[PDB]
Amino acid sequence: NTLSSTESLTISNNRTLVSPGDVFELGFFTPGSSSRWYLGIWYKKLSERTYVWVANRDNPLSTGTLKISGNNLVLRSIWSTNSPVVAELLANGNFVMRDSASGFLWQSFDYPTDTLLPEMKLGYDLKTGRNRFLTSSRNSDDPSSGDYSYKLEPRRLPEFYLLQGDVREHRSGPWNGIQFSGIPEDQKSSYMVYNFTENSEEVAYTFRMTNNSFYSRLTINSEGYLERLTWAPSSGAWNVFWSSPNHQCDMYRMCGPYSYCDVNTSPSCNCIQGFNPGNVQQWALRNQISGCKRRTRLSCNGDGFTRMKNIKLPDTRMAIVDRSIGLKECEKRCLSDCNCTAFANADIRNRVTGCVIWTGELEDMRNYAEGGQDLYVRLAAADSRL
Amino acid sequence: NTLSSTESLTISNNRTLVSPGDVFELGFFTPGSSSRWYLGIWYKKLSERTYVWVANRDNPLSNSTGTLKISGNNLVLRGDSIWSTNLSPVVAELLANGNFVMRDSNSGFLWQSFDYPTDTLLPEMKLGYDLKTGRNRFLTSSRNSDDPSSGDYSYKLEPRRLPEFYLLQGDVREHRSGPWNGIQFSGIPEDQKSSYMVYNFTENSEEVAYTFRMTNNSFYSRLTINSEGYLERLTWAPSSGAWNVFWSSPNHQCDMYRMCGPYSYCDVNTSPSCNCIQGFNPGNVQQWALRNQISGCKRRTRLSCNGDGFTRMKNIKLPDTRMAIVDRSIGLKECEKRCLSDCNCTAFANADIRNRVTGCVIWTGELEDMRNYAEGGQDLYVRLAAADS
Amino acid sequence: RCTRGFRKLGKCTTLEEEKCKTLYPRGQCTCSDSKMNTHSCDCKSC
Amino acid sequence: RCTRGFRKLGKCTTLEEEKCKTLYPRGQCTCSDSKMNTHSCDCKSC
Numbered sequence A: 001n002t003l004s005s006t007e008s009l010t011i012s013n014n015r016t017l018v019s020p021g022d023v024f025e026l027g028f029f030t031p032g033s034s035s036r037w038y039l040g041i042w043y044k045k046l047s048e049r050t051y052v053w054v055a056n057r058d059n060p061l062s063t064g065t066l067k068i069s070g071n072n073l074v075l076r077s078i079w080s081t082n083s084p085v086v087a088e089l090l091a092n093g094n095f096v097m098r099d100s101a102s103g104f105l106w107q108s109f110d111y112p113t114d115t116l117l118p119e120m121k122l123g124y125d126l127k128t129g130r131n132r133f134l135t136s137s138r139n140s141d142d143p144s145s146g147d148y149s150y151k152l153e154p155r156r157l158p159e160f161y162l163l164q165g166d167v168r169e170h171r172s173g174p175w176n177g178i179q180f181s182g183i184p185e186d187q188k189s190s191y192m193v194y195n196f197t198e199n200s201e202e203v204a205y206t207f208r209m210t211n212n213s214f215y216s217r218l219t220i221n222s223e224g225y226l227e228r229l230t231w232a233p234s235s236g237a238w239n240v241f242w243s244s245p246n247h248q249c250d251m252y253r254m255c256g257p258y259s260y261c262d263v264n265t266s267p268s269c270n271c272i273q274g275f276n277p278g279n280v281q282q283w284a285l286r287n288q289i290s291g292c293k294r295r296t297r298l299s300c301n302g303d304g305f306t307r308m309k310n311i312k313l314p315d316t317r318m319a320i321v322d323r324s325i326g327l328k329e330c331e332k333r334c335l336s337d338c339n340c341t342a343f344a345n346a347d348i349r350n351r352v353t354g355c356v357i358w359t360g361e362l363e364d365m366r367n368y369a370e371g372g373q374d375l376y377v378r379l380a381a382a383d384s385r386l
Numbered sequence B: 001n002t003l004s005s006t007e008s009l010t011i012s013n014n015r016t017l018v019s020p021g022d023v024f025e026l027g028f029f030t031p032g033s034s035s036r037w038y039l040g041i042w043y044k045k046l047s048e049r050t051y052v053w054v055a056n057r058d059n060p061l062s063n064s065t066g067t068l069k070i071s072g073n074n075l076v077l078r079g080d081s082i083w084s085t086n087l088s089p090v091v092a093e094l095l096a097n098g099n100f101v102m103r104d105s106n107s108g109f110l111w112q113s114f115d116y117p118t119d120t121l122l123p124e125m126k127l128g129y130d131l132k133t134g135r136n137r138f139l140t141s142s143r144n145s146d147d148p149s150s151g152d153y154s155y156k157l158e159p160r161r162l163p164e165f166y167l168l169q170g171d172v173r174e175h176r177s178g179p180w181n182g183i184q185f186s187g188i189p190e191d192q193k194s195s196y197m198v199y200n201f202t203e204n205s206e207e208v209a210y211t212f213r214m215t216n217n218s219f220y221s222r223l224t225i226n227s228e229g230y231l232e233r234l235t236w237a238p239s240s241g242a243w244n245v246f247w248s249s250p251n252h253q254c255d256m257y258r259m260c261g262p263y264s265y266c267d268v269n270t271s272p273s274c275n276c277i278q279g280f281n282p283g284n285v286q287q288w289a290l291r292n293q294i295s296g297c298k299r300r301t302r303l304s305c306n307g308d309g310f311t312r313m314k315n316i317k318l319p320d321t322r323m324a325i326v327d328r329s330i331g332l333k334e335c336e337k338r339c340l341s342d343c344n345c346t347a348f349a350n351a352d353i354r355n356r357v358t359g360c361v362i363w364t365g366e367l368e369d370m371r372n373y374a375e376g377g378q379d380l381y382v383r384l385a386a387a388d389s
Numbered sequence C, D: 001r002c003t004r005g006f007r008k009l010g011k012c013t014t015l016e017e018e019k020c021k022t023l024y025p026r027g028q029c030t031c032s033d034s035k036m037n038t039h040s041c042d043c044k045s046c
């Protein structure tokens, strides 16, 4: 009953629900000299307030309370969730509306602010149509909506974008079975596992703790960097474990089409083998937006492929996937289609490797000194020897 | 007379000085929504105004009135005093290169704008220390593109025994150039094959200063520290009608000052960035495990002074030169002996990377603010216990 | 969703703002300053 | 003109401001937000 609320009401005076296991706590709060009030969830056991959810981040509430009004949680209506229904806060920080099975009627998890906790879902639901994405707060003492979001793009081959407003600043790349190149998780972590769920009802990224002495989260901070912050018992602060983007080669289309950004070269931009700079005067001034043009025209049948190693796969707007075939067939299928410009494996670790095919321009590519993937790029027969 | 000012006045109503060559033009101007007026130089042939100097960058002319005249031994600028130089017949002359000098009408300029820079280093201008005056000439950024007042960043030489530049926000060191190796600073990454310019770092009795010169004058190039605190080379070629950012500094976190702790180096190819020097291990292993690497590394084996050796790092940005001593008269084999002979010596390196020229730099204390590169950089010999060599 | 655009080193300028307008012959195209000393030309309409 | 200090990934936090002081508690240490998603601890007086 100290994590649930029924006929009762929670005033700014002064009751707080607390999750089973001590980890999270719902209540009211005012940050800084704001004299503004918000309904939110935080880590209970931490001296410095770290907020993981907020009910009214841009409808700021010295009175304001919320209880149940018919079949809904209303907050006074500053905010509301459009039989005896109980609102409960579970052990993972999800604030639920249920009947007294997980047939919840409303989750806070479906309405993220700037943070992804373990077992929260970053991605969309095809059944309901809701896309769950992170939106930055304005700054550390103001949880209202900032200018940055990190959002899964619904498409045949989904990938994440970091946006400033509606401007794409950075692109995660597609999932490869293990990871997105731009969510650079520690794959040998001892306290975390990561998952990308993709099926006919939802596609979403999630992570889970293997050891609950640690806390970890994903937050996109006020300047528009996505970071993983881990709290170890061996410290009294959140440590930034990784940060993204963290190189100009990670900035969306730092380079032009058919070139790839390389952190070990001057200039950063390099033509794919078989391609030449599109605008030679611009490139000599290191204006490389022109990208590269193929030097030998394609002949469709009898075209060939050059293999790129250690690459981040190009923007997936015009990619089609077939996970049921392998690379030899994928090449055959790419060849037959005169507009196929490149193909790659869908999932390296499976015995059926799947096929990804691009038409159109190859965009937003960078390489890596280790890791990355193969990309087979279509060339005229002559140049295909490169 | 197009070019000089004498017993006359220059006011917003309305004369300007132009240079022999038509590249620059001095006069008044006011930008954007603001009603503030300023005196300065700009490129004349450029429809978008690019300002290379501003006398009263932080003392704006209040109303729409102001005057620049000579008054005895000084250039003055009044608004019905806002700015003035301080100090036979004197004339204020704007040179071909964009330098507004004060002359004896009868080299030995009394004053020059080149010595009082704003945010821009022009060709032939000097970035650094004038030993005759004791003045440090350095860049300070503007508040933004619309407001030429003084911003929060500077790029300034630290004229030590082995000098280097620091990019500062206020007084906080954000980035560091590295020392001069004979042809470059690692943090001022020029194209050493440029068709149209050359570069020099001068270290002598009169100055310690960086400078570049145009080799084909159909090109404009400059160094400018922009309002966010990046040092950029912007080039204007005849072809396009825009300034092109040819390079930017710093451009990665591995360029930020002490992104890694002592005795480690930053690498753009690794996660995490910081890497112990060989023979060294993380200094706080629980922090390194959370990828907090401010601790840097500690050496594995204790030093013996005698019989110690060195591990070779290559492709390195040489560490912060505060505790560095340079003797350019001795080569690398003797540098090793001299470093071995003093147990405070933590590392040594060549002073000049060109072929057959040489020198010796020696560090004491922690090695700081290092990073590697896939190409270029230099060798650094780090002192290790003979076991670990 | 208009996808044409590019990214460059340095800050947005007024001449670059005119260059953003070349991406599409219709629509609202502008310059956005960004992190790591880059800017981009993108179009909210086309 | 004080010397030691450090740089980290991420923005300044209150906890970060505190760990800044324990460098030289005599001197004036402060946490500075910087570009490229870094902050630095630097102590002025010494």
Ligand SMILES: *[C@@H]1O[C@H](CO)[C@@H](O)[C@H](O)[C@H]1NC(C)=O
Binding pocket: A193, A194, A195, A196, A197
């Ligand atoms: C979770 O991730 C692991 C990866 O280590 C994977 O083996 C497992 O099948 C995933 N399960 C779910 C339900 O996501």
Ligand SMILES: *[C@@H]1O[C@H](CO)[C@@H](O)[C@H](O)[C@H]1NC(C)=O
Binding pocket: A211, A212, A213
């Ligand atoms: C959980 O973490 C602690 C310290 O990190 C470790 O000692 C313990 O073995 C971990 N639990 C498991 C099941 O490995």
Ligand SMILES: *[C@@H]1O[C@H](CO)[C@@H](O)[C@H](O)[C@H]1NC(C)=O
Binding pocket: B198, B199, B200
């Ligand atoms: C300028 O640099 C060039 C190339 O290193 C060199 O030939 C010349 O001596 C330098 N000038 C001075 C004054 O050092």
Ligand SMILES: *[C@@H]1O[C@H](CO)[C@@H](O)[C@H](O)[C@H]1NC(C)=O
Binding pocket: B216, B217, B218, B238
């Ligand atoms: C200067 O550069 C331009 C552009 O490349 C070239 O056309 C011209 O001939 C050059 N002038 C000289 C004197 O080399």
Ligand SMILES: *[C@@H]1O[C@H](CO)[C@@H](O)[C@H](O)[C@H]1NC(C)=O
Binding pocket: B341, B342, B343, B344
């Ligand atoms: C090493 O450092 C100590 C510090 O006081 C100094 O006294 C000693 O002279 C130094 N070694 C040499 C060879 O100067």
